[PDB]
Amino acid sequence: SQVFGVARIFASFNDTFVHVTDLSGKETIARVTGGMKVKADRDESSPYAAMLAAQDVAAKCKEVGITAVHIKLRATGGTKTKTPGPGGQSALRALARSGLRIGRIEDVTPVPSXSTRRKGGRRGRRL
RNA sequence: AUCGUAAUGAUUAAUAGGGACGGUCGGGGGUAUCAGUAUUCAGUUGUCAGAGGUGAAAUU
Numbered sequence: 001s002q003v004f005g006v007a008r009i010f011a012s013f014n015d016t017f018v019h020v021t022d023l024s025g026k027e028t029i030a031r032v033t034g035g036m037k038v039k040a041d042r043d044e045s046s047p048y049a050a051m052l053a054a055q056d057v058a059a060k061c062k063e064v065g066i067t068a069v070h071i072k073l074r075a076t077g078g079t080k081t082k083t084p085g086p087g088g089q090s091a092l093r094a095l096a097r098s099g100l101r102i103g104r105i106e107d108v109t110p111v112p113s114x115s116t117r118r119k120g121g122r123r124g125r126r127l
Numbered sequence: 128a129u130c131g132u133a134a135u136g137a138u139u140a141a142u143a144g145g146g147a148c149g150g151u152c153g154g155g156g157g158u159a160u161c162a163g164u165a166u167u168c169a170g171u172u173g174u175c176a177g178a179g180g181u182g183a184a185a186u187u
């Protein structure tokens with residue numbers, strides 16, 4: 001029936017990666033970031049840039065033959081934030097609204113089982 | 128020295144303490160040992176123009 005890729009959406013708070021691979025992830029099909037859609041750094045992670053990135057990703061997927069994708073959303077994780085960035089929701093809605101078919105959705109944010117020391121110092125970053 | 132007298136001679140066990148013992152109970156300690164993902168670094172792979180960071184930037 002359908003041909004599945006894997007839409008690996010990495011939504012940090014400074015950028016948004018929309019990366020579609022095969023099932024294994026060893027073959028990259030399309031990787032469009034929110035920074036390729038705007039010329040200002042402050043909105044590289046904007047929902048608008050993520051939507052444009054997703055539309056370009058869907059267009060590239062269609063001409064290669066990918067008709068459906070599984071979703072692996074992730075935040076920065078590690079010692080940094082575990083909540084996904086603002087662009088991951090827009091890239092997901094744009095992908096679903098672009099004619100690509102959606103399979104399983106999962107959050108794959110890296111979470112330590114403890115961890116290393118987090119930047120900022122003992123008193124945190126004072127603002 | 129022996130013998131005879133005598134009701135012959137030792138206070139409780141403290142909701143003080145100490146000790147023993149019996150099933151436990153603890154992220155109490157020491158010495159080994161076994162996980163976990165994460166971080167970074169490295170090796171292979173895949174694409175292609177940005178990535179990072181910020182209030183905005185810039186160093187990179």
Ligand SMILES: CC[C@H]1CN2CCc3cc(OC)c(OC)cc3[C@@H]2C[C@@H]1C[C@H]1NCCc2cc(O)c(OC)cc21
Nearest residue numbers: 013014042120123124125126127180181182183184185
């Ligand atoms: C860390 C040293 C200063 C440097 N200056 C330059 C001018 C400027 C202009 C802004 O607006 C154009 C702006 O955005 C807020 C931030 C700044 C920064 C703020 C900072 C003061 C800090 N101490 C208290 C106030 C405050 C508030 C914040 O939100 C905030 O976040 C980074 C930080 C702070």
Ligand SMILES: [Mg+2]
Nearest residue numbers: 124125126127
């Ligand atoms: Mg303050």
Ligand SMILES: [Mg+2]
Nearest residue numbers: 140141143144
């Ligand atoms: Mg007693």
